[PDB]
């Protein structure tokens, strides 16, 4: 599908495109603390022709480019290169950025993304969590963790 499913779920009035209000409602269903300018940010990037709607191609292009960035952010946390993120890697990656986070705080992050209870975050879990979050790189993700979810991260 996979976007085709998401797109149709978003296109509530079935006119074949997603308007900013429809996207706004979609974000609302995620239960993740995004800013009230999140759909505006997504549209700023995604509505390439500035006609005020996201067609499927624009929607797909937005998500596909976003996914690429999210893979790079995932990779930058995966210090041992096994395709998984564990708590210790969050601690050590932030430390190399000059940020201190305790093991317990890193576990809170892990718990918010880990869906199958492995205490490891895999690409699908990471991607799905971040799919509709406007963040563009690991720093923004960290900004989100501290300033939106309250995780204790000190510089
Ligand atoms: Ca629509
Ligand atoms: Ca808004
Ligand atoms: Ca458009
Ligand atoms: Ca790893
Ligand atoms: Ca997991």
mmCIF file of C-alpha atoms and ligand atoms in Angstrom:
data_model
loop_
_atom_site.group_PDB
_atom_site.id
_atom_site.type_symbol
_atom_site.label_atom_id
_atom_site.label_comp_id
_atom_site.label_asym_id
_atom_site.label_seq_id
_atom_site.Cartn_x
_atom_site.Cartn_y
_atom_site.Cartn_z
ATOM 1 C CA UNK A 1 0.000 0.000 0.000
ATOM 2 C CA UNK A 2 1.233 1.532 2.497
ATOM 3 C CA UNK A 3 0.667 5.241 2.101
ATOM 4 C CA UNK A 4 -2.489 4.555 0.041
ATOM 5 C CA UNK A 5 -4.128 3.288 3.194
ATOM 6 C CA UNK A 6 -3.050 6.334 5.204
ATOM 7 C CA UNK A 7 -4.073 8.714 2.408
ATOM 8 C CA UNK A 8 -7.621 7.359 2.130
ATOM 9 C CA UNK A 9 -8.034 7.405 5.914
ATOM 10 C CA UNK A 10 -7.026 11.080 5.857
ATOM 11 C CA UNK A 11 -9.198 12.053 2.882
ATOM 12 C CA UNK A 12 -12.382 12.154 4.963
ATOM 13 C CA UNK A 13 -14.662 13.882 2.429
ATOM 14 C CA UNK A 14 -13.334 11.613 -0.328
ATOM 15 C CA UNK A 15 -12.516 14.376 -2.812
ATOM 16 C CA UNK A 16 -9.243 12.653 -3.653
ATOM 17 C CA UNK A 17 -6.939 15.123 -1.904
ATOM 18 C CA UNK A 18 -5.931 15.874 1.658
ATOM 19 C CA UNK A 19 -6.590 19.383 2.932
ATOM 20 C CA UNK A 20 -4.834 20.983 5.881
ATOM 21 C CA UNK A 21 -7.877 20.446 8.106
ATOM 22 C CA UNK A 22 -8.034 16.769 7.237
ATOM 23 C CA UNK A 23 -4.327 16.448 8.039
ATOM 24 C CA UNK A 24 -4.937 18.340 11.276
ATOM 25 C CA UNK A 25 -7.587 15.807 12.282
ATOM 26 C CA UNK A 26 -5.282 12.917 11.388
ATOM 27 C CA UNK A 27 -2.492 14.237 13.642
ATOM 28 C CA UNK A 28 -5.042 14.547 16.420
ATOM 29 C CA UNK A 29 -5.636 10.782 16.280
ATOM 30 C CA UNK A 30 -1.974 9.915 16.952
ATOM 31 C CA UNK A 31 -1.984 10.962 20.596
ATOM 32 C CA UNK A 32 1.516 12.412 20.268
ATOM 33 C CA UNK A 33 2.182 15.956 21.502
ATOM 34 C CA UNK A 34 2.790 17.841 18.224
ATOM 35 C CA UNK A 35 2.608 21.630 17.975
ATOM 36 C CA UNK A 36 -0.532 23.205 16.523
ATOM 37 C CA UNK A 37 1.612 24.226 13.493
ATOM 38 C CA UNK A 38 2.552 20.666 12.595
ATOM 39 C CA UNK A 39 0.186 20.293 9.624
ATOM 40 C CA UNK A 40 1.288 23.774 8.479
ATOM 41 C CA UNK A 41 4.928 22.633 8.520
ATOM 42 C CA UNK A 42 4.076 19.456 6.608
ATOM 43 C CA UNK A 43 2.125 21.457 4.025
ATOM 44 C CA UNK A 44 4.928 24.008 3.666
ATOM 45 C CA UNK A 45 7.178 21.154 2.494
ATOM 46 C CA UNK A 46 4.637 18.834 0.895
ATOM 47 C CA UNK A 47 2.247 21.099 -1.050
ATOM 48 C CA UNK A 48 4.733 21.594 -3.851
ATOM 49 C CA UNK A 49 2.314 23.310 -6.272
ATOM 50 C CA UNK A 50 0.849 25.597 -3.589
ATOM 51 C CA UNK A 51 -2.742 24.741 -4.589
ATOM 52 C CA UNK A 52 -3.682 24.213 -0.928
ATOM 53 C CA UNK A 53 -4.095 20.430 -1.103
ATOM 54 C CA UNK A 54 -1.826 17.390 -0.875
ATOM 55 C CA UNK A 55 -2.462 15.008 -3.718
ATOM 56 C CA UNK A 56 -1.300 11.427 -3.381
ATOM 57 C CA UNK A 57 1.976 12.104 -5.197
ATOM 58 C CA UNK A 58 2.773 15.049 -2.903
ATOM 59 C CA UNK A 59 1.725 13.026 0.162
ATOM 60 C CA UNK A 60 3.923 10.109 -0.901
ATOM 61 C CA UNK A 61 6.820 12.386 -1.737
ATOM 62 C CA UNK A 62 6.565 14.131 1.649
ATOM 63 C CA UNK A 63 6.590 10.844 3.572
ATOM 64 C CA UNK A 64 9.275 9.232 1.434
ATOM 65 C CA UNK A 65 11.660 12.174 1.906
ATOM 66 C CA UNK A 66 10.783 12.348 5.585
ATOM 67 C CA UNK A 67 11.469 8.626 5.962
ATOM 68 C CA UNK A 68 14.934 9.068 4.416
ATOM 69 C CA UNK A 69 15.794 11.684 7.032
ATOM 70 C CA UNK A 70 14.360 9.497 9.799
ATOM 71 C CA UNK A 71 16.568 6.608 8.675
ATOM 72 C CA UNK A 72 19.624 8.859 8.944
ATOM 73 C CA UNK A 73 18.541 9.890 12.450
ATOM 74 C CA UNK A 74 17.985 6.241 13.429
ATOM 75 C CA UNK A 75 21.413 5.368 12.046
ATOM 76 C CA UNK A 76 23.122 8.134 13.992
ATOM 77 C CA UNK A 77 21.824 6.582 17.265
ATOM 78 C CA UNK A 78 22.652 2.973 16.344
ATOM 79 C CA UNK A 79 26.266 3.049 17.558
ATOM 80 C CA UNK A 80 26.883 -0.701 17.214
ATOM 81 C CA UNK A 81 25.352 -0.861 13.716
ATOM 82 C CA UNK A 82 22.887 -3.710 14.391
ATOM 83 C CA UNK A 83 19.818 -1.909 13.083
ATOM 84 C CA UNK A 84 18.369 -1.523 16.584
ATOM 85 C CA UNK A 85 18.385 1.301 19.128
ATOM 86 C CA UNK A 86 18.837 0.417 22.789
ATOM 87 C CA UNK A 87 18.860 2.625 25.883
ATOM 88 C CA UNK A 88 22.645 2.644 26.247
ATOM 89 C CA UNK A 89 23.030 3.910 22.681
ATOM 90 C CA UNK A 90 20.688 6.824 23.349
ATOM 91 C CA UNK A 91 22.806 7.679 26.406
ATOM 92 C CA UNK A 92 26.097 7.434 24.484
ATOM 93 C CA UNK A 93 24.943 9.224 21.304
ATOM 94 C CA UNK A 94 23.550 12.211 23.202
ATOM 95 C CA UNK A 95 26.758 12.310 25.220
ATOM 96 C CA UNK A 96 28.836 12.697 22.032
ATOM 97 C CA UNK A 97 26.550 15.629 21.169
ATOM 98 C CA UNK A 98 27.432 17.033 24.583
ATOM 99 C CA UNK A 99 24.053 16.134 26.096
ATOM 100 C CA UNK A 100 23.582 14.235 29.358
ATOM 101 C CA UNK A 101 20.659 11.845 29.747
ATOM 102 C CA UNK A 102 20.411 9.157 32.413
ATOM 103 C CA UNK A 103 19.724 5.522 31.678
ATOM 104 C CA UNK A 104 16.263 5.817 33.259
ATOM 105 C CA UNK A 105 15.345 8.809 31.084
ATOM 106 C CA UNK A 106 16.593 6.969 27.987
ATOM 107 C CA UNK A 107 14.332 4.082 28.944
ATOM 108 C CA UNK A 108 11.342 6.450 29.043
ATOM 109 C CA UNK A 109 12.168 7.376 25.464
ATOM 110 C CA UNK A 110 12.511 3.668 24.594
ATOM 111 C CA UNK A 111 9.161 2.863 26.203
ATOM 112 C CA UNK A 112 7.373 5.570 24.177
ATOM 113 C CA UNK A 113 8.425 3.971 20.871
ATOM 114 C CA UNK A 114 8.857 0.260 21.657
ATOM 115 C CA UNK A 115 5.629 -1.485 20.690
ATOM 116 C CA UNK A 116 6.523 -5.195 21.014
ATOM 117 C CA UNK A 117 8.295 -4.814 24.376
ATOM 118 C CA UNK A 118 11.794 -5.839 23.248
ATOM 119 C CA UNK A 119 13.303 -2.715 24.854
ATOM 120 C CA UNK A 120 14.916 -2.239 21.456
ATOM 121 C CA UNK A 121 13.529 0.079 18.794
ATOM 122 C CA UNK A 122 13.502 -1.307 15.260
ATOM 123 C CA UNK A 123 13.167 0.699 12.050
ATOM 124 C CA UNK A 124 9.410 0.116 11.690
ATOM 125 C CA UNK A 125 8.758 1.253 15.270
ATOM 126 C CA UNK A 126 10.936 4.354 14.814
ATOM 127 C CA UNK A 127 9.479 5.214 11.401
ATOM 128 C CA UNK A 128 5.857 4.692 12.489
ATOM 129 C CA UNK A 129 6.361 6.794 15.597
ATOM 130 C CA UNK A 130 7.930 9.644 13.663
ATOM 131 C CA UNK A 131 5.908 9.374 10.422
ATOM 132 C CA UNK A 132 3.725 12.444 11.019
ATOM 133 C CA UNK A 133 6.053 14.335 13.388
ATOM 134 C CA UNK A 134 7.532 17.338 11.459
ATOM 135 C CA UNK A 135 11.058 16.776 12.921
ATOM 136 C CA UNK A 136 13.766 16.645 10.236
ATOM 137 C CA UNK A 137 16.893 15.266 11.950
ATOM 138 C CA UNK A 138 18.178 13.742 15.176
ATOM 139 C CA UNK A 139 18.692 17.152 16.774
ATOM 140 C CA UNK A 140 15.054 18.104 16.212
ATOM 141 C CA UNK A 141 14.051 14.712 17.571
ATOM 142 C CA UNK A 142 16.068 15.434 20.704
ATOM 143 C CA UNK A 143 14.458 18.891 20.887
ATOM 144 C CA UNK A 144 11.058 17.174 20.699
ATOM 145 C CA UNK A 145 12.004 14.680 23.426
ATOM 146 C CA UNK A 146 13.005 17.444 25.815
ATOM 147 C CA UNK A 147 10.620 20.278 24.906
ATOM 148 C CA UNK A 148 7.519 18.250 24.008
ATOM 149 C CA UNK A 149 7.748 15.059 26.079
ATOM 150 C CA UNK A 150 9.703 16.458 29.032
ATOM 151 C CA UNK A 151 12.583 13.986 28.961
ATOM 152 C CA UNK A 152 15.451 15.194 31.171
ATOM 153 C CA UNK A 153 18.285 16.026 28.781
ATOM 154 C CA UNK A 154 20.846 18.573 29.988
ATOM 155 C CA UNK A 155 23.452 20.602 28.119
HETATM 156 CA CA1 LIG B 1 -10.195 15.552 1.028
HETATM 157 CA CA1 LIG B 2 -2.713 24.382 12.849
HETATM 158 CA CA1 LIG B 3 -0.837 20.520 -3.909
HETATM 159 CA CA1 LIG B 4 22.225 -0.721 18.064
HETATM 160 CA CA1 LIG B 5 10.768 -3.153 19.875
#
